Amino acid sequence: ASVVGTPKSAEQIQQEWDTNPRWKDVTRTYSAEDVVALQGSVVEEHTLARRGAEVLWEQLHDLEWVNALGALTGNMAVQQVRAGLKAIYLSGWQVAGDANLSGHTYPDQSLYPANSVPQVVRRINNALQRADQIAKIEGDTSVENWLAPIVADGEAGFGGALNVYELQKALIAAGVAGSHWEDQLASEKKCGHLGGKVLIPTQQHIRTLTSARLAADVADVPTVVIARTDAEAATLITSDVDERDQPFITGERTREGFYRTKNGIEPCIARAKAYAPFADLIWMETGTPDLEAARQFSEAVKAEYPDQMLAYNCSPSFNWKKHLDDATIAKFQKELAAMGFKFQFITLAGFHALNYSMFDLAYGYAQNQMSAYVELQEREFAAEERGYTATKHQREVGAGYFDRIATTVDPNSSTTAL
Amino acid sequence: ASVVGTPKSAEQIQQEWDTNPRWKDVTRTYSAEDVVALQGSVVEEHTLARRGAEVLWEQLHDLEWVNALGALTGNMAVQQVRAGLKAIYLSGWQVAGDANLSGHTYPDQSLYPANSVPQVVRRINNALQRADQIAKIEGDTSVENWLAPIVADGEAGFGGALNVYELQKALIAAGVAGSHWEDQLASEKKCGHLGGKVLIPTQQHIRTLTSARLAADVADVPTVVIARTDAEAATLITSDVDERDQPFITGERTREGFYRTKNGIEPCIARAKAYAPFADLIWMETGTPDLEAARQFSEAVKAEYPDQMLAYNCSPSFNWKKHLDDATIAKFQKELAAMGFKFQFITLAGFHALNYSMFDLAYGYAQNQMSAYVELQEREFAAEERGYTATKHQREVGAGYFDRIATTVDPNSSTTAL
Amino acid sequence: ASVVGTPKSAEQIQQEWDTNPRWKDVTRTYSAEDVVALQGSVVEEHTLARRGAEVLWEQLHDLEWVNALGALTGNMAVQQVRAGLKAIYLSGWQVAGDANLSGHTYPDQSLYPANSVPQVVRRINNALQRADQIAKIEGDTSVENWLAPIVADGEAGFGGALNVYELQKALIAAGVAGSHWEDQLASEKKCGHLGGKVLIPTQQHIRTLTSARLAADVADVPTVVIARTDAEAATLITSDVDERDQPFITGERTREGFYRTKNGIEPCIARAKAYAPFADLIWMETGTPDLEAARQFSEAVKAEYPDQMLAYNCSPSFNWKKHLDDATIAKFQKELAAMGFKFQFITLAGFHALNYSMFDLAYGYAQNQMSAYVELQEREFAAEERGYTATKHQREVGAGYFDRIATTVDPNSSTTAL
Amino acid sequence: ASVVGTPKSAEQIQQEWDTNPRWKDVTRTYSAEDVVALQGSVVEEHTLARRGAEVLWEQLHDLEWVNALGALTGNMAVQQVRAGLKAIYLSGWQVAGDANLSGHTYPDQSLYPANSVPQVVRRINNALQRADQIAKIEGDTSVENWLAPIVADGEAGFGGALNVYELQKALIAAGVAGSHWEDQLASEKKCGHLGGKVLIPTQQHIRTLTSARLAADVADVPTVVIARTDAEAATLITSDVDERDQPFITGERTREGFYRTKNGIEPCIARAKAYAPFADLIWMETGTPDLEAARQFSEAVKAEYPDQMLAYNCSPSFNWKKHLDDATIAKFQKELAAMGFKFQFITLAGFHALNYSMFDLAYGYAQNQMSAYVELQEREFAAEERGYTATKHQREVGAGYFDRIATTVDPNSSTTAL
Ligand SMILES: [Mg+2]
Ligand SMILES: [Mg+2]
Ligand SMILES: [Mg+2]
Ligand SMILES: [Mg+2]
């Protein structure tokens, strides 16, 4: 009947894996036939997921490094691109705190509904598409690519391999460019004294990463897969079954039956090497920015996998000015980029900008009413010199674009040619 | 069987209508028995909607005036309350541009799914409830009422009287304190030359207000009902059937069948008087903040209804400093309050704070990476002096509250007494 | 940069419009350049919407007629295809009563959230895709096309031309094959004596149809557009402004400003002819199935537009056996197909099957417990002979498909070759 | 300020626990002060959750037994009540297969978003409320209680204690009467040879049940808590840490690190006794109905806890007629009731009625068109004698109720007194 969305043959897929440099050093423990068998007889095309993943991959090789800021609303992402950023970071922490499908405010422990991040990915793409549409009818070519790739937080997948599979598939349907997956069991994090994060076995994370790659393969898009390890601070692990984890197991076992494990950079380096054949980028979660630890981690990983790119979160909570001089702060990301940290981001940038700007405005408004708003309005007028366009609020949300649709539909009215 | 949620009798409802000062000068064209007949045999209690509405009503009489800022996320509302505001305004325009259930960015023309505002009302209540929970376990009594009343945008109800009924019902279920309803048909707004907003007949808006009151009565809560008229700028009206609208009909009818109508403060004053018996507060939509025009509207309506409270939106798009001196800007709301505008707000405060703060941070970040973030962090550290708490990010989203739930559940872990 | 999703040029679009027989006799009052101007710089591919629409269009020419049953859940659609049907009808009435995003039960008056039908279209596609996936791994080739095209109810678009545009766009995103649009304002339907449905002007419905076609063109898919007229029973019309509606205007205008208008097959025929250039299929809403009336409508429209295909709803509420003999009932659709009604359906089939089957089972269960369930189970066992598979419940919902994903991910577990 | 929703004091709560027979034999390892500390300063009232839980509790003591059928849509539940059932069972399996928030069809492995069952609980209550509203305006007193209690499937809580807490809280907000929680880790279920379900430690399930009780206490409603054990068929357990589980551990450990454990009735009885102080009802999950196993399980539990009520799922997949005579089938539930199984249900009744009725209708329709629908319509007319009302479809979904609202709002129209 129809040839629309006809699946590729296993041979074609194998050929891509064998020859496209995108797949150099990418280990897949399942086969091309295994992928085809899961595709049914029609494969939906996921345009934004394909384009974003391809653009992101090229940027990670073409730019000195790719940096991003966590965005929790569509307008936040639009402003990030308008301001010149080339990628968007979709923080799971921010979604938990102010943008998830339960409607509740949550701390970061995989408490929100599992399809929440995919919904925000779709929202951000929709917002970027509107900016793109508006730019086109306005003849605005100041931004080359409105559809900046989105890198989204997949926590640990909300369950087992099938939960990770479904989350990746949903992220892709929504248009994600890349996704990160970590090796802890947040839902078992122990409170207080002698508690802390609980890691899962090294082999279980390889399963997570393998499942994430499989969902992208079945969906037929080259999604960027990022592996995150939480071994830097985690003091517990669910099981001592994996021989690669045994060197760090002390012997003490908790009431819940978990195993105490020695944390630090050593286990991060080891897990990072075990994860490398299964990840396009590796990320060592960290609490305190530390150039030496970063250097130690990257040199140890690259000694084994020289071309392995790394990802890095720049702490949003660290008191930067108190601990570092201005020059160190200014060169921090450039320095990390030289070590191979090609994707860098500040997870909670949106949470801080949103909470701070509203607190400041509201406080001034509670005290001086209109005077406080005028102060913000004047800053917005001043920002126009830098390319800010939201002072023209109707235009910003598409009133001119919808007026054009109305005009297009109205036969007694003509549209202006572009 | 169970007496949980048993409806009150028509006689009890009538007694409240007859004696509670809340209903002084409130016209209901339907009966107490009509209300009971629509309640089935169980009436769900809507705690937040009841408490919010009672609190708002008292504040409108106890404070010089109640002012608010448009909030589009839960955290935004939390900061508004933390900063000292006593009510939250939930803008439909902001929901259309960055927080509605379609996932798209839209201009203000009743384009988003009709249950969008209710979902944001529920979200803001959840967020305020979390701030309240955290405060209680922290012994923080700095904020006396975290559950600030929410006043939400009902547009024109997304259709007819039954659509307005269902939206008011959904707003109440989500915990709204008050809702506003306007007299235009946004979906038929005409673009360009000789176009403009289209009003509906005065009687149709009374139907809308009557339907919003009926839904509040059936739901057994004293929701504050606000009437907005768009007659200042509207140049069209769907029909000349209502003799109260005839003094403004020009006699011309457009190619789409709408009637040309004389706009300005005159029809606003007439509509306001016709709406007074059906609204707890009245709002004349206006493009230009102008104390004299406000005084003219206020005095004209109060000459007929001396005790009629009014609401006023302080234009977010008007170039304040270009047209008014700092003194006039500084006294603007105070002056309005003296005229009887007891509820005042800035509809797009959130849109501007969110868009501006992210553009500014992202622009600095694109240029100087971490240096830009440090600038925002320093402002946040400085704001702690004014009561800002979001710099303690984990605490802000409830990590301490959930750690307590975790500890409460763990029998081998004791909780510290509050 | 990337060429993924690059829009076609206006010249390419024009060439398709000029040469593809799909567009024979399709009037577009806007231009190819107008379409391109609204597409931004990336056009997402909508695989299911494209494939569905192409398949439906071919079926409408290849089969004697295409018939369908209203489906309100994914499993309902799966059984329709498993049973041999070639298209799925997605009723808005069923969505209002038991499957819309407000969570409430509603009558048919455009009361539910506007994105409700799109969500059910997405759901039905997901369900059919799962049946397809299961079939593929089971080697089941009994059903040739699991992805049967979906024809969905667009009501009157929930507002104006921009609301219709957004609903058509959302239906396409979800994978719809065709959508129907009607010429009434349901939200103003008048109850009781001298009341009834309210039509909108002929030109306003052409605007609706033009807007649905425009959204399909911008989304780059050949969606089947169906026009429905409610003029058989409607007694009112919003305006007498369109001279094509004037022959039916009585001259009386109601207290609400609506115009009394002569109803019946005559205005239906005139509207159908005015709509023909803007619709792939036309449907005259009718309360009484009547082959003669159908013939009269069909012949009157085809006398003007010989190749115009028509759609027909076979009334679910009409007491068939009371008014027609078994022979007439048996030949009804065949007879209609010969008149040119190429798409035929029963709108509320799902509502009736679901409500009846649960009442019957529950009633027996309340009386005789397990005996009642066994009666249904025996019917299911007997239906396996006709191809029914849901008795193997785990398999029916994909347990075998997910076991395969699990096995594919597990390197210590091999999958059996298909 | 307001006293609306003011929390009860710890002393008041303690008093209820000490004196209300509802709490006889209910162990809470946290205190009344612990509950109050988590309530913030306003407790939302959850009317439907309170009424349903109270009604369910009384029915479990007043009736010989309470039985139910799985319902996955609002109309299904309405028909169940109309047909005479006194409770509704909300199956997680059915939600996974045809009614969850991902829009996908899933097998039963906790794959769907965690707030899916709560949404269906709210939908069912909304549908029952509409039936209730319609009955009242129609003067229909044939059904005494339209708001039948809903018992919902909580799987294992989608994570740890905090995930169970949030799910229970969401079920309560939606109006649930009771919820069941099981002791397996579905997301780790192993495939094929030597695989099977994986149990969690006995103490971990006590944590789950303790967390479920805590959420109900904080929400201030007497929710019925049901504990389910999956030890009958589970062959694995995550850890051997709990001494109560050690007697069944063999010693073999799997590649994933799980422990092989001896399954059967013995471990079910042991877990059931450990769960009894934490559950209002206990349920032994089973695959094959077996009166002897049921008798053995109940007598063993009651030997320790004489007043402990039990719950029982009557297998929807067992071939009843093939293995049992008609008399045994007819007395099955009555016999179980005598053993103490006071809540009985068929989990997949809705899935079978929905899939079978649509397959049958569609198959007949594909073959004989209208004749097949007429057959269903005639059965519906015949069912009217038993009280079926859905043949009057407009009435059934509330058209008369909304017409009454329209009339109530219309001052020129009067409503008919009840
Ligand atoms: Mg996280
Ligand atoms: Mg508006
Ligand atoms: Mg309809
Ligand atoms: Mg289950």
Side-chain angles (χ1 to χ4, degrees), chain C residues 92-93 108-110 112 153 155-156 180 182 184 186 228:
Chain C
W93 188 111
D108 181 15
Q109 272 194 84
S110 298
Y112 57 83
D153 189 339
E155 304 282 4
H180 64 78
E182 66 201 50
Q184 75 167 300
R228 153 174 156 171

Side-chain angles (χ1 to χ4, degrees), chain D residues 245-305:
Chain D
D245 301 324
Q246 294 175 352
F248 308 102
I249 303 291
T250 66
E252 306 145 283
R253 205 124 102 72
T254 73
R255 279 296 138 192
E256 294 86 17
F258 303 139
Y259 296 73
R260 282 186 179 294
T261 183
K262 305 193 303 282
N263 59 94
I265 194 173
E266 206 176 309
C268 293
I269 288 175
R271 287 187 170 229
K273 302 180 175 158
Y275 300 157
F278 305 97
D280 299 312
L281 293 108
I282 308 184
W283 170 16
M284 171 174 66
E285 157 73 346
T286 190
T288 302
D290 181 339
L291 275 188
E292 187 43 44
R295 185 177 296 109
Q296 197 189 157
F297 174 78
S298 65
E299 299 191 341
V301 174
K302 287 190 176 290
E304 290 294 312
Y305 302 85

